[PDB]
Amino acid sequence: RLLYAVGGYDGSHTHLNSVECYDPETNEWSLVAPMNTRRSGVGVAVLNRLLYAVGGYDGSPDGHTHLNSVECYDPETNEWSLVAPMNTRRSGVGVAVLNRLLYAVGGYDGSPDGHTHLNSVECYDPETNEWSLVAPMNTRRSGVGVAVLNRLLYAVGGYDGSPDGHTHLNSVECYDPETNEWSLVAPMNTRRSGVGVAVLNRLLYAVGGYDGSPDGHTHLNSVECYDPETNEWSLVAPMNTRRSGVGVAVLNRLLYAVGGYDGSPDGHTHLNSVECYDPETNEWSLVAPMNTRRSGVGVAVL
Numbered sequence: 001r002l003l004y005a006v007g008g009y010d011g012s013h014t015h016l017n018s019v020e021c022y023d024p025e026t027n028e029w030s031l032v033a034p035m036n037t038r039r040s041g042v043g044v045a046v047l048n049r050l051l052y053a054v055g056g057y058d059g060s061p062d063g064h065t066h067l068n069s070v071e072c073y074d075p076e077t078n079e080w081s082l083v084a085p086m087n088t089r090r091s092g093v094g095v096a097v098l099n100r101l102l103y104a105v106g107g108y109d110g111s112p113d114g115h116t117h118l119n120s121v122e123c124y125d126p127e128t129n130e131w132s133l134v135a136p137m138n139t140r141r142s143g144v145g146v147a148v149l150n151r152l153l154y155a156v157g158g159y160d161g162s163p164d165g166h167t168h169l170n171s172v173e174c175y176d177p178e179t180n181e182w183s184l185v186a187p188m189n190t191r192r193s194g195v196g197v198a199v200l201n202r203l204l205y206a207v208g209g210y211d212g213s214p215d216g217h218t219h220l221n222s223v224e225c226y227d228p229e230t231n232e233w234s235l236v237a238p239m240n241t242r243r244s245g246v247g248v249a250v251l252n253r254l255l256y257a258v259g260g261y262d263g264s265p266d267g268h269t270h271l272n273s274v275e276c277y278d279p280e281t282n283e284w285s286l287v288a289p290m291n292t293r294r295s296g297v298g299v300a301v302l
Contacts, residue, residue: 001024001251001252001301001302002021002022002023002251002301002302003021003022003024003249003251003256003258003299003300003301004019004020004021004022004032004044004051004073004298004299004300004301004302005019005020005021005022005029005247005258005259005290005294005297005298005299006019006035006039006042006044006051006053006297006298006299006300007019007035007038007039007040007042007044007053007056007294007296007297007298008039008040008042008245008247008259008292008294008295008296008297008298009040009041009059009245009270009294009295009296009297010270010292010293010294011261011267011268011270011293011295012269012270012293014060015038015039015040015057015058015059015060016038016039016040016292016294016297017034017035017036017037017038017039018031018034018035018292019031019032019033019034019035019073020032020290020291020292022256022274022287022288022290024251024252024254024287027287027288028288029274029288029289029290029291031291032073032075032078033073033078033079033080034080035053035071035073035080036069036071036080036081036082037056037058037064037067037069037071038056038058038060038064039053039055039056039057039058039067039298040056040057040058040059040091040295040296041055041056041057041091041092041093041107041108041143041245041296042054042055042056042091042093042296042297042298043055043056043090043093043094043095043104043107043146043298044095044247044298044299044300045095045096045097045102045300046097046300046301046302047097047100047101047102047126048100048126049302050072050073050074050126050302051072051073051075051300051302052070052071052072052073052083052095052102052124053070053071053072053073053080053298054070054086054090054093054095054102054104054298055067055068055069055070055086055089055090055091055093055104055107056091056093056296057091057110057296065089065110065111065112066089066090066091066108066109066110066111066114067089067090067091068085068086068087068088068089068090069082069085069086070082070083070084070085070086070124070131071083075302083124083126083129084124084129084130084131085131086104086122086124086131087120087122087131087132087133088107088109088118088120088122089109089111089114090104090106090107090108090109090118091107091108091109091110091142091296092106092107092108092142092143092144092158092159092194092296093105093106093107093142093144094106094107094141094144094145094146094155094156094158094197095146095298096146096147096148096153097148098148098151098152098153098177099151099177100125100126101123101124101125102123102124102126103121103122103123103124103134103146103153103175104121104122104123104124104131105121105137105141105144105146105153105155106118106119106120106121106137106140106141106142106144106155106158107142107144108142108143108161116140116162117140117141117142117159117160117161117162118140118141118142119136119137119138119139119140119141120133120136120137121133121134121135121136121137121175121182122134134175134177134180135175135180135181135182136182137155137173137175137182138173138182138184139158139160139169139171139173140160140162140165141155141157141158141159141160141169142158142159142160142161142193143157143158143159143193143194143195143209143210143245144156144157144158144159144193144195145157145158145192145195145196145197145206145209146197147197147198147199147204148199149199149202149204149228150202150228151176151177152174152175152176152228153174153175153177154172154173154174154175154185154197154204154226155172155173155174155175155182156172156188156192156195156197156204156206156226157169157170157171157172157188157191157192157193157195157206157209158192158193158195159193159194159212167191167213168191168192168193168210168211168212168213168216169191169192169193170187170188170189170190170191170192171184171187171188172184172185172186172187172188172226172233173185185231186226186231186232186233187233188206188224188226188233189224189233189234189235190209190211190217190220190222190224191211191212191213191216192206192208192209192210192211192220193209193210193212193244194208194209194210194244194245194246194260194296195207195208195209195210195220195246196208196209196243196246196247196248196257196260196299197248198248198249198250198255199250200250200253200254200255200279201253201279202227202228203225203226203227203279204225204226204228205223205224205225205226205236205248205255205277206223206224206225206226206233207223207239207243207246207248207255207257208220208221208222208223208239208242208243208244208246208257208260209243209244209246210244210245218263219242219243219244219261219262219263220242220243220244221238221239221240221241221242221243222235222238222239223235223236223237223238223239223277224236236277236279236282237277237282237283237284238284239257239275239277239284240275240284240285240286241260241262241271241273241275242260242262242263243257243259243260243261243262243271244260244261244262244295245259245260245261245295245296245297246258246259246260246295246297247259247260247294247297247298247299248299249299249300249301250301251301253279254276254277254278255276255277255279256274256275256276256277256287256299257274257275257276257277257284258274258290258294258297258299259271259272259273259274259290259293259294259295259297259299260295260297261295268295270293270294270295271293271294271295272289272290272291272292272293272294273286273289273290274286274287274288274289274290275287
């Protein structure tokens, strides 16, 4: 019942290992223990009441680039511990939990001799501490939003940055673990990479992102929601701020949009602001800002 913001990038030019958590009862953000590794474009999810940070990028001057390492945070010890690394280095990776496994979906391996956007997918079993590749998606996607609903895993939008492809996606695909198959479903209204996705009231919400198509919308404040029962996407109220590379999660039946980046006359502004959406009112309200500006930030509730 706390909202955690993990890692990200502060381009006001820092890759972050710090972590902070938000208490809706106090409307305050507090720093907790930092990760072992700086991680921009990091995926995060909760499994067995532990917070996992998956992949990312460390663009600071050192021997790291795009990361296959994974670490685990225990709130009782306030410690991050390395666990099994992934099969693949992935930044801009979507992470979600399905059937007691943690899935890492897509992403980008920009390391030397990697240089690729990924359609591969792998899953982590905490009982064995191992990652296994599963069926790949139909489309390579980095900056992909992922979420689970009705025992199906959705990959929403993203970017295929293959030089001959270079497409910001409105398509959406659905993985059934029973068949190990990915199927395309209804596409969004808007192409979105760096999109935040979360589930609220049995609807998938796609929040913000970036439309990098030619003469497209660029940074997005728009929000759309998907009902698996109808297999259709509908626009709902837009955010106060345009947010690309935004992190989202649901807490006390409210949808939180955390951080991100927006355009500015000098390039990009990286955001420490936070807002929350009430489906009952269809309105977005700003709440307390984070201690640190963070885009490419992992957000989850524990």
